[PDB]
Sequence to fold (148 residues):
Amino acid sequence: AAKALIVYGSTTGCTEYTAETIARELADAGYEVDSRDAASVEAGGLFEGFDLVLLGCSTWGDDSIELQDDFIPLFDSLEETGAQGRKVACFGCGDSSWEYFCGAVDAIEEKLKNLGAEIVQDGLRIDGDPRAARDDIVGWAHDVRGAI
Ligand SMILES: Cc1cc2nc3c(=O)[nH]c(=O)nc-3n(C[C@H](O)[C@H](O)[C@H](O)COP(=O)(O)O)c2cc1C
Fold:
């Protein structure tokens, strides 16, 4: 009955597997889940019709914090997605060898807050292998549902 959208930007598959794991948790709890690669979406009205939106994005950049490339157009047009009043939470893969660990998650959360979204949980930051972190991912999904 409640509808969740998960949109992920992933280049090596880490954030995509994380998104799949979240989608299964939410669907087992009774949500209808639509999980979309950011490469396939357009920003205008993207969040319309959804009760919960989860945004996943890995972090990149040779010497600066950059978002995963398929997520950049969505971030640049986040003001047109329908985020005002929307229950959101963010997740992403990264590598703690880097100073700005999952820094894309911070950038997306900051812009969502300016846009009036309701961030329902602190962002999930996956370091290294996501299958190794599966219990952390499922637990975070449970906590997001519990904060609605
Ligand atoms: C050039 C480069 C820069 C990166 N910069 C960061 C970074 O600043 N912070 C971070 O947490 N991870 C950084 N990473 C690591 C990745 O985000 C990590 O490999 C991640 O697992 C990719 O997730 P994805 O498969 O979902 O795209 C960097 C990786 C590369 C190759």
Notes: The pocket of flavin mononucleotide is lined by residues 10-15, 58-62, 65, 68, 93-95, 98, 100-103 (CB under 6 Å). The chain is about 30% helix and 25% strand. The longest helix spans residues 14-28.
